[PDB]
Symmetry: C3
Subunit: 65 residues, 3 copies
Amino acid sequence: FTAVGKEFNHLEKRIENLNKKVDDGFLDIWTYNAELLVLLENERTLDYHDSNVKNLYEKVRSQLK
Amino acid sequence: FTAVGKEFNHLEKRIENLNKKVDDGFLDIWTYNAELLVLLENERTLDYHDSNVKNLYEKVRSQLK
Amino acid sequence: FTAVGKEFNHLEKRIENLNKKVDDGFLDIWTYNAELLVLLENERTLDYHDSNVKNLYEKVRSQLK
């Protein structure tokens, strides 16, 4: 019977809410990383055709899904 | 009686400690983002008066509370 | 008897899996921060000998363990 109890559901929903907080926080971080990168690449600071620069685009792309 | 039991409190405190780890980790990340940004803006790399650059300051400000 | 029950172990393993997700996510973020920084420092954008620039290397080093 524990999975219908109040206490099990309290803890479960706290886990779920933390997992959501982590997902939304990671999305916020990686959206920031994307917004910064594209500005930095607008300069001669970072060149889009350098393979090390493409590595960053590819990570950001993959993180934003 | 479960909320006074040892097991419920063990799990609850693990949740709490994870939530703290997430908060402190996000604060570390966003403090880093702030420290990097202000250095990058010291250059002509990023211009503080560009509206896309202000977007980044505003996100960092909001994240650091 | 609760620590051998199914429900306690279900919640515990969810905590553990979330903690792993957080660790792996933070490592991904800080690896990205390292990869970006070293590219930015390749330019006159950021000078490795400036003490504020060394602060960033030191944080990244410490985060990657």
